Design an enzyme around this catalytic site. Structure first.
Site, short mmCIF file in Angstrom:
data_model
loop_
_atom_site.label_atom_id
_atom_site.label_comp_id
_atom_site.label_asym_id
_atom_site.label_seq_id
_atom_site.Cartn_x
_atom_site.Cartn_y
_atom_site.Cartn_z
N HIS A 43 1.05 -1.36 -0.10
CA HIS A 43 -0.25 0.38 0.29
C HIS A 43 0.83 1.02 -0.13
O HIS A 43 0.25 2.13 -0.65
CB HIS A 43 -1.15 0.61 1.17
CG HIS A 43 -0.67 0.31 2.31
ND1 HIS A 43 -0.39 -0.51 3.38
CD2 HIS A 43 -0.58 1.83 3.16
CE1 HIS A 43 0.46 -0.24 4.95
NE2 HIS A 43 0.10 1.33 3.71
N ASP A 99 -0.56 -7.51 1.72
CA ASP A 99 0.16 -5.98 1.97
C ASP A 99 1.78 -6.48 1.64
O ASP A 99 2.33 -6.15 2.80
CB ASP A 99 -0.55 -5.37 2.95
CG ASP A 99 -0.28 -3.86 2.81
OD1 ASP A 99 0.20 -3.39 1.94
OD2 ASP A 99 -0.27 -2.71 4.27
N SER A 205 4.72 2.02 7.99
CA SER A 205 4.24 1.25 7.22
C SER A 205 5.61 0.71 6.20
O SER A 205 6.47 2.10 5.79
CB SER A 205 2.59 1.39 5.80
OG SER A 205 1.90 1.34 6.39
C1 LIG Z 1 0.96 2.79 4.54
C2 LIG Z 1 1.15 2.79 6.95
O1 LIG Z 1 1.29 3.85 7.37
C3 LIG Z 1 0.10 2.44 7.89
C4 LIG Z 1 0.36 1.62 9.18
C5 LIG Z 1 -0.92 2.03 10.02
C6 LIG Z 1 -0.21 0.83 11.13
N1 LIG Z 1 -0.93 2.36 12.57
C7 LIG Z 1 -1.14 1.55 13.02
N2 LIG Z 1 -2.21 1.29 14.55
N3 LIG Z 1 -0.32 0.23 13.89
N4 LIG Z 1 -0.92 1.90 7.08
C8 LIG Z 1 -2.63 2.23 6.43
O2 LIG Z 1 -2.30 3.91 6.71
C9 LIG Z 1 -3.45 1.44 6.10
C10 LIG Z 1 -3.62 1.75 4.58
C11 LIG Z 1 -4.98 1.77 4.21
C12 LIG Z 1 -5.61 2.04 5.14
N5 LIG Z 1 -5.03 1.82 6.48
C13 LIG Z 1 -5.12 1.51 8.14
O3 LIG Z 1 -4.63 1.41 8.78
C14 LIG Z 1 -6.44 1.97 7.68
N6 LIG Z 1 -6.63 2.76 9.50
C15 LIG Z 1 -7.92 0.66 8.25
C16 LIG Z 1 -7.70 -0.32 6.90
C17 LIG Z 1 -8.66 0.19 5.87
C18 LIG Z 1 -8.32 -0.72 4.68
C19 LIG Z 1 -8.09 -1.81 4.62
C20 LIG Z 1 -7.14 -2.40 5.88
C21 LIG Z 1 -7.35 -1.71 7.25
#
Ligand SMILES: *C[C@@](*)(O)[C@H](CCCNC(N)=[NH2+])NC(=O)[C@@H]1CCCN1C(=O)[C@H](N)Cc1ccccc1
Ligand SMILES: *[C@@H]1O[C@H](CO)[C@@H](O)[C@H](O)[C@H]1NC(C)=O
Ligand SMILES: [Zn+2]
Ligand SMILES: [Zn+2]
Ligand SMILES: [Zn+2]
Lengths: 257, 43
Positions: A43, A99, A205
């Site tokens: 992602h 992912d 991420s």
């Molecule tokens: C792309 C990264 O930086 C991030 C990591 C977040 C980790 N958070 C915690 N508390 N450990 N990932 C994201 O922001 C991903 C990308 C798509 C949206 N997303 C989420 O984490 C959303 N808040 C929830 C979600 C949406 C759709 C599919 C799965 C999860």
């Protein structure tokens, strides 16, 4: 990373920063698995809901980079990308199942005291270490807190941040969220009652979740920061791509290209 | 020990050298928080 600490020099030599080429913008974390291959989260490269769909020429990576803004010539390295490979069955529409992405460096990076690859788990190391209650370590340059509103600063560290977190039992992970969990993910973080806090956050991420093997003293990347609900919320846990479960795909891509 | 899984022709170099940090494991020195990790295996 929320409630982490500053990394010591050379503590995570496999740390890779993924940047937009133009204009320069830090996008995500990543990890070095050889002198020419980098692992990250899909992602970070492809996520249509956020109008994200990068090509190799849109990006670059920095390795051995200790300061967010200070250039250390002869220490940090910059590499362009030859090719990007995203899991063909990465489910961006629903739950970020698989992912994972690999990025091939345009030229190999030289190893040093500050740049070194992390190991990928074999079956027996994964069987041993991926147990509820065992702790792993997550590193990143991401947000230091969840925001509330967008105009409140989310904190941007000047040194890589590190936090150690326990793997959580699968039924507890499943019950903590409405998102459909798969066996290609695991979750980690402290329970409300454990008196400790910490979590990855937006911007983290692609960063590695690593564990030290008590068998050969080496660090293994067991997970990739993938998703969560906010960051460091009581009763919520961070989700990570299960690297061993996806190892046959990594092999197919690399020993096939 | 360490047994390699990938082919160096396509993986490039470094798999046999992985996961050992020059400033820690190679110098028999622990970083400040790795004992928390090791301890979790036994507690
Ligand atoms: C792309 C990264 O930086 C991030 C990591 C977040 C980790 N958070 C915690 N508390 N450990 N990932 C994201 O922001 C991903 C990308 C798509 C949206 N997303 C989420 O984490 C959303 N808040 C929830 C979600 C949406 C759709 C599919 C799965 C999860
Ligand atoms: C990413 O962009 C390219 C267009 O250059 C296209 O092949 C592909 O459909 C896009 N990926 C999506 C939206 O799944
Ligand atoms: Zn430095
Ligand atoms: Zn080495
Ligand atoms: Zn103890």
């Amino acid at each position: 990373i929320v409630e982490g600490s500053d990394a010591e020099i050379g503590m995570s030599p496999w740390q890779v920063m993924l940047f937009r080429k133009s204009p320069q913008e830090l996008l995500c974390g990543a990890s070095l698995i050889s002198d020419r291959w980098v692992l990250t989260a899909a992602h970070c490269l492809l996520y249509p809901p956020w109008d994200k769909n990068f090509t190799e020429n849109d990006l670059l990576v920095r390795i051995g980079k200790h300061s967010r803004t200070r250039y250390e010539r002869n220490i940090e390295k910059i590499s362009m990308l030859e090719k990007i490979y995203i899991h063909p069955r990465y489910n961006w529409r629903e739950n970020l199942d698989r992912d994972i992405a690999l990025m091939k460096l345009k030229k190999p990076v030289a190893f040093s005291d500050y740049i070194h690859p992390v190991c990928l788990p074999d079956r027996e190391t994964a069987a041993s270490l991926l147990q509820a209650g065992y702790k792993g370590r997550v590193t990143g340059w991401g947000n230091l807190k969840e925001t509330w509103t967008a105009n409140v600063g989310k904190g941007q560290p000047s040194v890589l941040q590190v936090v150690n977190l326990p793997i959580v039992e699968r039924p507890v992970c499943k019950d903590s969220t409405r998102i459909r969990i798969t066996d290609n993910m695991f979750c980690a973080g402290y329970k409300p009652d454990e008196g400790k806090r910490g979590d990855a956050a937006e911007g983290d991420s692609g960063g590695p979740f690593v564990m030290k093997s008590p068998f050969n003293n080496r660090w293994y990347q067991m997970g990739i920061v993938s998703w969560g609900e906010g960051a460091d919320r009581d009763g919520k846990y961070g989700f990570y791509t299960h690297v061993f479960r996806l190892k046959k795909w990594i092999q197919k891509v690399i020993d096939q290209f | 020990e360490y047994q390699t899984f990938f082919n160096p022709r396509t993986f490039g170099s470094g798999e046999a050298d992985c996961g050992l940090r020059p400033l820690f494991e190679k110098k028999s020195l622990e970083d400040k928080t790795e004992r928390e990790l090791l301890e979790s295996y036994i507690d």
